[PDB]
Amino acid sequence: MPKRHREHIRKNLNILVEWTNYERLAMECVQQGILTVQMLRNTQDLNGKPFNMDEKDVRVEQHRRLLLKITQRGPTAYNLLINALRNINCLDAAVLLESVDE
Amino acid sequence: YQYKDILSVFEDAFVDNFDCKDVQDMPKSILSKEEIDHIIMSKDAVSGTLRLFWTLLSKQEEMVQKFVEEVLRINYKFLMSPIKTEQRQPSMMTRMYIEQRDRLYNDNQVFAKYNVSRLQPYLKLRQALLELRPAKNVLIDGVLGSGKTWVALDVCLSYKVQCKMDFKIFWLNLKNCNSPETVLEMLQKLLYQIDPNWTSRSDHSSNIKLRIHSIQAELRRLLKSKPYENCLLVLLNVQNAKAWNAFNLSCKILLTTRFKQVTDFLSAATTTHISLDHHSMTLTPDEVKSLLLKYLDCRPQDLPREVLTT
């Protein structure tokens, strides 16, 4: 997909990571065929250094990690995200996702 | 055609999207065991992907097809298409890049094969290239025979370098250029490699120096032409700042200073200066063992060497 989608996903990391749950999004995306075991393990995992800092932002950062991974996936995967988010029913983020396009 | 040549083009894609951390499905034969390790400790993708390319090119031409054709198809979905669309069709600019690059191997035949990539400097030099203004120049200085020629060619080879530089790169070795005749033929050959055309009527034996002024003016005029806006004229082993004093015609030149006088003559502001006699500039023990493996060519017997000399 075009770089405009990249700037949208990076600039809207906060709203996307806050509207959406971590585990539900992970299970949805992996059951969407978006991820394999190795890449989901990598995305969930972190440096291990952030173990010292507060867990409160750890999973969120991991959730942030998810975005940083899915921007890597093919142009239609974002549409899959559009689909996957509707499986989440987290449409508040979906409208913002679709706002930049068309 | 080939796969290895087309690899060097789109480093930007891999640094942008590819990550070796999630790609650890190594076939034993496609890699040398440790590099599905050493890439990771060597940062994420700025150096990890560069050394990935270096290692990938280290082997022969088949495991790269293995990488693109089965290793890549499991996880990367953007990434099938570019190689299939690049391997066969081969665009016009890729063709000229590989032509110039095969030329750059052609005129070396020693470093062209016996090279060992010294990452960290190369990592800290092409940035000045991607910045270099049409008037500035880059200085690199270090110990005699520091691979200054080696590293210059190493960095030059970066596809980014040819691509921005508009693939026009030209070399001059400043050997015995300490006489106001020793540069005349230098200017002549520079003209000829620029163009084998010359108005030989202006030759006046009255002033070899007035003649050098005339040729500098003429070659400067040729410089300020639409294609030659960014033509790379590197000077090798600058004998003295006097030689450069002729070689100053508002170009994206760059110099590998060999002597302290030469490198200290230049202004650090108007001319960026990079060292080699520096702790981080020098070679890692990994670099040294890679070189002794390039030469001795014995992995099991590599351990039989001590730890000395740099």
Question: Who contacts A75 (Cβ-Cβ below 8 Å, separation ≥6)?
Answer: A1, B78
The continuous run of DSSP H or E covering B137 comes out as strand B137-141
Instruction: Tell me how far apart the alpha carbons of residues B177 and B84 are, in angstroms, rounded to a whole number.
Output: 49
**What are the φ/ψ torsions at residue A57 (nearest 5 degrees)?**
-95, -5
H helices of chain B, where?
4-7, 11-16, 35-41, 48-58, 62-66, 80-87, 92-106, 111-114, 119-131, 148-156, 159-164, 184-194, 208-223, 241-246, 260-265, 285-296
Which residues of chain A are within 8 Å of residue B36 when distances are taken between CB atoms?
A: none
**CB nearest B22 (choices: A42, A71, A74):** A42
Closest CA to A34 of A78, A99, A86, A98: A78
Q: How many CB pairs under 8 A join A and B?
A: 26
**Calpha distance B76→B58 (Å, rounded):** 23
| CA–CA distance, B254 with B271 (Å, rounded to integer) | 9
Residues 6+ apart with CB under 8 A from A12: A96, A97
Q: What is the experimental method? A: cryo-EM
Tell me which residue of B288, B293, B290 sits closest to B307, measured CA to CA. Answer: B288
Per the DSSP assignment, residues forming a β-bridge with B273 are: B139
Q: Whole-angstrom Cα distance, residue B48 to residue B26? A: 16
Measured CA to CA, the distance from residue B176 to residue B173 in angstroms comes to 9
Distances (CA, A) of B275 to B50, B166, B244, B263: 22, 27, 19, 10
- Sheet with B271-274, edge to edge strand ranges: B169-173, B232-238, B254-257, B137-141, B271-274
Distance CA B261, CA B288 (A): 30
CA of A49 to nearest chain B CA: how many angstroms apart? 14
Q: What are phi and psi of B231, to 5 degrees?
A: -110, 125
Helical H segments across chain A, by residue range = 3-11, 13-19, 22-31, 37-44, 55-70, 75-88, 91-99
**Resolution, Å (one decimal):** 7.0
For testing contact with chain A, the best of B75, B79, B80 (most A CBs within 10 A): B75
The partner residue sitting opposite A73, judged by closest CB among B24, B25, B77, is B77
Backbone angles phi, psi at A54, to 5 degrees: -65, 135
Establish if A10 touches chain B: CB-CB under 8 angstroms: no
**Contact between B77 and A36 using a beta-carbon 8 Å cutoff:** no
User: Cβ contacts (< 8 Å) between B24 and chain A: which residues?
Assistant: 38
Tell me if A73 sits within 8 A of B77, measured CB to CB: yes
Distance, CA of B157 to CA of B113 (rounded, Å):
13
Least Cα distance to B50 among B151, B131, B155, B130 occurs for: B155
Interhelix angle B184-194/B208-223, rounded to 10 degrees, is 20
